[PDB]
Structures are given as structure tokens and as C-alpha cells.
Symmetry: C3
Amino acid sequence: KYIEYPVLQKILIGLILGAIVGLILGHYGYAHAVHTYVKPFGDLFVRLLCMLVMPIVFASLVVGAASISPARLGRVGVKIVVYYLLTSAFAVTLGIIMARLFNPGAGIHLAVGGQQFQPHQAPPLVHILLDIVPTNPFGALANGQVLPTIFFAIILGIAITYLMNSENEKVRKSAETLLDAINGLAEAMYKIVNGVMQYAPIGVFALIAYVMAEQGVHVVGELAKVTAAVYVGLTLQILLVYFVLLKIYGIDPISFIKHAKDAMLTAFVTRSSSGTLPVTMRVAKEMGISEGIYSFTLPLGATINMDGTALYQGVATFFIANALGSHLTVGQQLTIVLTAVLASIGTAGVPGAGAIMLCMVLHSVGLPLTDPNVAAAYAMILGIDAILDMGRTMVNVTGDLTGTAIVAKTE
Amino acid sequence: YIEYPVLQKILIGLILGAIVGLILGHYGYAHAVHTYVKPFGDLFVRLLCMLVMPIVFASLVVGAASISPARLGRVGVKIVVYYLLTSAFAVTLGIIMARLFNPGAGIHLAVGGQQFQPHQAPPLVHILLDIVPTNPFGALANGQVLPTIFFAIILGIAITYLMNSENEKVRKSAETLLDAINGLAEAMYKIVNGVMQYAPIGVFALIAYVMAEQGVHVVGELAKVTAAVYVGLTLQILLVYFVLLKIYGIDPISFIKHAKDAMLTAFVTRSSSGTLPVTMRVAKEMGISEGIYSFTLPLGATINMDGTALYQGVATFFIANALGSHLTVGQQLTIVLTAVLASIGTAGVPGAGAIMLCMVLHSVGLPLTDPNVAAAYAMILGIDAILDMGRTMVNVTGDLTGTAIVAKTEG
Amino acid sequence: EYPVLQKILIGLILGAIVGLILGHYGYAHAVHTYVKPFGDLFVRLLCMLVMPIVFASLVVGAASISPARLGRVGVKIVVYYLLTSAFAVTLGIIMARLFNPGAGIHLAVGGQQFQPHQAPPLVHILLDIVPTNPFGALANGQVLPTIFFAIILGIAITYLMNSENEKVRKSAETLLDAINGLAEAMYKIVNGVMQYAPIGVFALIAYVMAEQGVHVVGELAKVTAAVYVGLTLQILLVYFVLLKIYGIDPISFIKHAKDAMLTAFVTRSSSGTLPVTMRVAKEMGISEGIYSFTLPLGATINMDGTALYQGVATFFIANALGSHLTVGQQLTIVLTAVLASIGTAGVPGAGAIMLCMVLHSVGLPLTDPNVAAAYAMILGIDAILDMGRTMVNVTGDLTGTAIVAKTE
Ligand SMILES: [Hg+2]
Ligand SMILES: [Hg+2]
Ligand SMILES: [Hg+2]
């Protein structure tokens, strides 16, 4: 009855097997039969993910904003935060650059309803800026106001830390309770994802089964385009910024990897920043980092790491937009990505944050997920998310070890 | 300062109100009652239908955390298995007595000068997908019934899994969130007590109008409901509790001789928690182990489904039959099993029978703002006090039957 | 980092100048398209907090006043505040009648004057105070229902804290502690917003002065006068009378409080002035076990100061729109605003926040160009009025604690 079977294998088996099942049911098969019977199982998966998108974004940004918040943040924490901000700055640039070098999306011009999707643009800059301030925070949270909820979660989280710097213990315990309850909710939402990723093998099967059956055979190359663009910018991040930052701080990059070798390979196969944390701290000890440093910097890196997701969103955004037929400019690209990345603080791992934040960025840009085109194109990245999330978490851990080595050397 | 037995108040208001209404019905003014008396009854209906969302949610989070494995102990597993198999019979008896007696037929209400037409029904695909809340906050916000149930269970379960974590940051966080969701649930119960203080006035006004407008046939139809519940009530005790006692080698005759006052307390207090002291004392009289009845009786006061199962069985059939819609056995158990599975943690809880009915009406599509649905619900809302007496009595009887069976299988 | 109160006053005085000269031969429209959006950002930032502070504050507030959780020394000071607000409401309205703010400026900005839509049957308006769904109420800005639910929740929480079950009693203690802190976080967020206030307040009156003419500055002076004369009239006619009736010399009482009031008049913070207040309570010779309990409560549950604010503010904002307001409706609106403002005494800018709450509850949409413009006027001079508002608050807390200590 039970499959206590490796969760990552399940999803990869479902993807590889599902594309086959769908593709042969595509050639001489019945694209429609797949759509009416197989697809609803995929739709159930998409709903289950798009469910958590609001609680995790909110509750995670409250805790996240509380972590980075001054002056609650210590002097050893300030320098590693500055580290992550300047690594994500390059990661965003690489994300877009690889999404420009490779061209995912073009080639497949989807118009599923017998009509191509038309994005409706755009309130005046006056009206779009005013609207980031939620007229009613509860209502914002209630009916999926994306940007307002971000704004409120940050301004709330920061305010909570200022209460924890108060002489009144009535006040200071109150904030400690509220933050503790907002956390745990965030934490419960992560555990719920783990459970949903258990349905992922069945759901991911059903998703690409339909897409392969209906969108032709061109899709598998376009998804390979995405995988390539991410994975080459993945290693380009390690080589061009992590290795440079190690070398510029007088740490040998070659012998650094020799320690992290299994710690990265664990992250590449576990996808969990928290699950790999024990392996990470042990390797930080191997390299000879101080106990009072890696016990504080590594739990933060497992949450406030933006650079990994920055490479995911860079390519994913461009693909999902290009596929719909809308040509996206470099200006809009970084506007969307910096939004997604700045909203993904505290959400580093988190099993499938890459695909979740993509939903959040779709609703905020106007594209309704109920629309047949937007739904179909999202279902493609949702298929190969497992693949991309492997490398996403691998670079995360690599950048946490690169950060902790640079921050320990300066101590 | 009306410092007077709350149950008497409501019964006085019901008996007196039906008289006042009925004579104001014969040669009186049905309309004057409707314009002046009825608004006081409407205030009562609002006050109840207010709590329906917080108690269902917060109660199901705590409820799901109680039954949740593997947080549940081995002595708790066996009593949970007990309650599942007693509710299975209670649901069957509930429907069976609602079929034997025929409440609802005879009074074909069409108050607006038009009979109510229930609008059915999205495809099974669309109705199943929709149990997953697209946005949990929104679900909670605008009265998504089934989605809120789904989310409350999946949240409550996830919270217990966090309490089995080595990280005390994680484990305290979940302990705080659950403690805050509880207490909210608990506060909602206390608010009901306060509302039941208005119940005598409100219940007066409700049946006063119904009797004045719906004729004299109503009192027999409500007697039909009371009979159907109370004969299935004793049929539960005789056919399943006594059989379960006898099959476990406990004498049913001498068992009742101990519980005699513990049941009669529950029949007059309506409170599973208020009767708990009387219950535990009687469990000691029968000679149950201290480490058993101190754990099994607080659970029975919350996760007891069998009592409500008899309430909802008859209430659903009446409220549907009265509206003119003929209900099948399939739909009956679909509705009841939904109501009962959503009523875990809500055993007492002063007026849960009438509250869960509101929840089941909104979930089935019938708007409570509709004049027919409102009138027919106001009928069961009138005689709820009567039915809730027996409802809580069977609850306590089944808790003592459970604890005796579970203690005998221990030592 | 610069003194926050100065900033706002500088922005107001400087902004009215900038706007007014840009009004005469300048460009009222250019101000509206470029300057005003910065003021609108300020109005949004305030109207943001209005729902969480009202709710969370009323839960904690209702838990404080709640019987029988309230002690016997607390019962008598609560009775004190109820009977001081009773007079403060009366004075608020009376000074709003004596002075006539609003009339003279008949604003019809859209080329049309605002028409308030009245009013469901008393049956339907009373039934609707009970929220059909508390979450929904909270979600989409049901004002009166949220008040109702916050009170009935807060009271219920105290009754759980009087329970033998420690599972039950800790649960309520946790929930209340988490609702507090949210309330407390909302106050800290206001402080941050008041840091933008100087820029935002500049932009608001800059537009109003530029577009509504020069008549506005006299009408705002009308509001300031009406508040400040009823402010001192409160101290003289009720605080001094209550001190004298309890055998305390009012003349020599002020001689001690002289700097404690002047601190509150310049700090605007009931909590920031609390150290100065307790020191003066010691100077007057109040018992340690009294002013350490009564003064922190007064810094929060003081309603009398805000009752004078809403009395004048409501009348002005309504009169300016062209709607003539009766004495019946006046006290209906004010008693609503004041009964919803318990726990919210300070709280940096509660006077302006509660005004938004009372505007949405009466039907006037803040998105409407007229309602928005008239609210932007009181929002401009709020800093001024909030100075005296907090000053009377602290004075009434010292008057209360002296009367309650003398009876102990
Ligand atoms: Hg989504
Ligand atoms: Hg309801
Ligand atoms: Hg507002």
C-alpha cells in the first residue's frame, strides 16, 4: 500500500514516464482523451501549489523581514546579509543573461482556446505605485493582492523587531508571541508542500502527459532549453562570482570544493536547504570555520538566499512570457525578477519555491492562471521544476559555504 | 439581572412563543409578527451563523491535531477506532429514523409566493477540484465551506508533524500557533454561551412568526423531528452501546445504574465540558484506571460524532423535505458524512447541532438569505434546545461506553 | 532623525506657503498632478492601519476593562474615565457648534457637490452590526461588525483566563498576547509613517491651498481654536471641579504638572511623557503602588482627549461637504468613534485614523474627490490638534490617579 520511496525519484520517474505516455498518445493517440481524464489530475496538482502561495509568501516575509531587520541583526549578520545582496545582484544579471542567450518560449506559440493570449496592460505609474499600499491589509491577504501583501509583510516584520527592543515586557513578549505564531504557520506551510510533493509524481505525470499530447514534440526541446539555460548559469555563478569572491578573499577555490563536494551533491539530491544543513555545518567545520559563526550564518542562508531563485525566475519568467507570444524587454525582465526575488526572502528551501514564486509573479503581472494559455505554459515549467530545483538548491548551499568562508576569514 | 437556568429560559420561550404566535395566528396578525417580532428572531439567526466559520475552522485544526498520527498515543488510537465505528452506525440510524418518520412533507413552504428551487450542481470534476482552496485566506474570508474544512485538516495534521521535530525553534513555533488557534476555538464556544443567553428571546421570536404564518401543522412536524431523534437516540444506546458492552463482557444493566446521573446531567446541561467532572467521577465509580479516563473523556467531549450524526440525519432530511425537494439515500449520507466529518472537535459546544446545519446549508447551495430556506431553518432552530439535550446525553453515554471498553482492554 | 513633530509642522507651515503662492498666479493643476500624489501616498499609508489597529486594539482594550478580570482599584478609575468622556463628548460637540468650521468652503471638486446616500431601516442597520462572517467582516472593512466582534472576543478571552483548565487558560493567554503585539506592531508602523508625514502633509495642504483658495487657512484655524478652547475648558470645568470636589487644590496642582503638561504638548507621546508624569505624581505625593498602575492605563484607555477631536473634526468634515449635521447624529457618530477608540489613546495619530474609520462607517467613500479633499484638510492640521489631544490625556490621567489615590 505504502510507497516510502525517494520523493525526488518519484517525480523524475513521473516526468520521464509521463512524457513518453503523453507523446505516444499524442502521435496516433487521443490528445482529447488525455485532456478530459488525465489532465484533471494535473489540475489538482496546480491547485494544491497555488493554494500555499499566499500563506508562504506572507508568513515567510514577516519572519524573513524580522531576520534581516536592523538593529535586531547582529554585526556578524550584517556582513553576511551584505554578502547575499551583492551575490543576488549578479545572480539576477546572470539569470536574465542566460534567458537571453538561450531563447526558451519562442518556437511554441500557444493559442489553445483557438485564440492567443493578450496581456492587458497597465495602470498609470501613479496608480500602480499607490496600489502597493494595501487599503485594507486583511482584504489584501484575503483576495490575493500580491504586491500589497508583500508590502504589509515587510512593514509588519520590521515593526515586530522594534517591539522586541522595548523595555516593556508586556510589549516585548507580545511581539515574541505574534512572531512565533506567524512563524510555524510559515513552517506548517513548508511541511504541507512536502506532502504535496508526494502527490507531485502523479500530478506532474498528468501535466506533461497532456502538454506532450497536445503541444506536439517541440516542447521537449524547449524545456531542455530552459534546463540548459539554468544549469549553465548555475555553474557560471559558481565560477564567475563564488570562485572570484573566494580568490579575492585569499581562500583557495579548488580545495574549497574538495570539502563541499558531498555537501553540494547532498543538496543536489535532497532539494532541502534545511535537510542538507547538518551536512553543511559538518563541512564548515572541516574547512575550519568558528562554531559561533556557521551556527548563525548557515540557518540564515537556508532562508534568505536569493541568488538561486534569481537564476530560476530569470529563465522561467522569460520562457513563460515568450511562450505566450509576448516579447519581454530587459527593463521589464529585471522589474519582474527583482520583485520575485525580493518577495522570496525566507523562502530558500522550501522544497519547490521556484514554481510557487512563479505563480505569485503571474498573478501580480495580470496573467490569470485560469486562462487556458497561461495555465498550459505554467504547466510546462511546473513539469520540469523538480529538475531545476535540484540545481537551485545546489547553488544555494554552495553560496552559503562561500559566504560563511568569506565571513569567517574576516573574523 | 436575569440570573436564571439557561435551558429553562429557552424552553419557556419556545412553549410560550408558540402559544403567543399561534393565537396571534388564528384571528391575529401574521404580518404584525413578521414586521416587529421576527426581526428579534433574525438577530438570533445572524448571531449563530456568525460563529459558524471560526468554530468550524479553528475547531477542525485542533480536532485534526488530536486524532493526528503519530502524535496520538496507543491508548488513544483504540478509542478513536471506537468512535469511528460508533458514528458509522449513528449515521445509519440517523438516516433510517429520518426515513421511518417523515418530517418536512405536509408543510410545502413557498413564502415569497414561490417555492424554492435548488440549483444543482457542477461536474464531479469541478466539484472535487474545488475542495482545494485556491487561496486559504480567501476561502476563510468569504465562507468557502468545503475548502476551509480541507485546509483546517491539512493544517492541523501538519502542526503535529512539526511537534515531532528536533528543532525547538520549529517545535515551539507550532506549539504557539496551535495554542493560539485553540483558545480562538475556545473563545468561540464561550461566545455561543453568551448567544444562548439571547436564545430565549430569539427563539421566542422565531417560532412566534412560524406558528403565526405557517399554520398549526408545524407543531406536529416538529414533534415528528423530536420523535425521530429521540427514538434513534435510545436505539443507539440499546443496539450499539449495549451490544458493544455485552460483546466486551461488561453488564449493560449495572453500567447504566452508575451513569444514571451522568447522563441526566448531560441531558440538562447540554455541555460535554460542563458534564465532564460528573462523567470522570462515574468512570471512577465503575473502576476505570486514572490514566485512561483522564485522556479518553476529554477527547470524547470533542471528537464525538455519533450524537451529531443522529441530529444531522433527521435535521437535513426535514429541512430539505420541507422545501419540497425529495432527498435520496445517496445524497443523505453524502451530506451527513460531510457534516459529521466537519464536526470533529465540536461535540460540546452548546448548540453545535444547529450551527453545523448552517454550514451544511451554505455548502449545498441553499442561501440562508432566501425566505424559504430561512423559514425552514428557523423551525429546527426553534426546537434545537430540545434535540441538543438528547444529543449531549447520547454523547456522554457513548464516552462512558467507550472508556469502559477501552479500560477493559488495558487492565 | 530630526525631531519628528518639528518636521510635520515645518512641512505644514512651509507647504501652505508653497501651495498658496503656487495658487495665486501659479498652477493649481501642476500641484495636483505632481505634488498631490505624494500626499495621496500618505493618506493610503494611514488608511492602511485603520483596520488592524481598530480590531486588535479593541480586543486588548475590551480585555482591560473586562469584568471580573478588572480589579477593584481598576473599576473606580474606569468609572472615572466613562464620566469624563461623557463631558468631553458634550464639550466636543458644543465647541463644534459655537465655532462653525466647514461652512464658508462649499467644496464641489469634480464639478459636482457630494451627496451622502442615506440609510438602511433601523431594523436593517442594527441587524448588520452582527457580522455574518467575522473573517469577511475583517477582510473587506466592515467597520461596525469588526467593532462588535472585537469587543465580544476580548471579553470572552478574559472569561477563559478565569478557568481552572490550564490548557484553556494558557491558550487564551497566547491568543491575547498575539493579538496584542499585532496592535503594538501597528503602533510602531504609525511612528514610521509619521516619519513620512512631513513630506506627505506638505503635499496635502500644498494642493488644498493651491486649489481651494485662501479661505481654507481660516477654516482650519477655526478647527484648531474650537479644539484648543474646549481643551482648556475640559481642564477647568471638569478636571479642576473633580479635583476640588475631592478636596485637592487645583491651583497648586497645576504648579506641579506645569512641565508634565508642557512636555505632553510638545512630545505628543503619552508613553514618552510617562516618565515625566510619574515623577510629578511623586512630587504631588501619590503612593508608588498607585501611579505605577494608573498612569500606564491612562496612556492607553484615555478617551476624553479624542472625544474633543472627533466632535470638532466630524462637524467640520461634514459641514465642509455641504451636509448640515444635527446634534442627534453628531453624538451618534462621536460616541461610535469614541467607543471604538478604547485602547487607542496614544498611538501617535489616532485622531486622524479614527476619522477615516468613522467616514467609512457613515458611507462617505474616501475615494470620492470631495470626501478625500476635506479629509486632507484635517489630516494636514492633525499634528497641531494631536499635541493638545495628548496633553489633555495626560492631565486627565493625573487628575484620575489623584482622585483614585485619595480614595485609597
Ligand atoms: Hg498560482
Ligand atoms: Hg449560516
Ligand atoms: Hg480608511
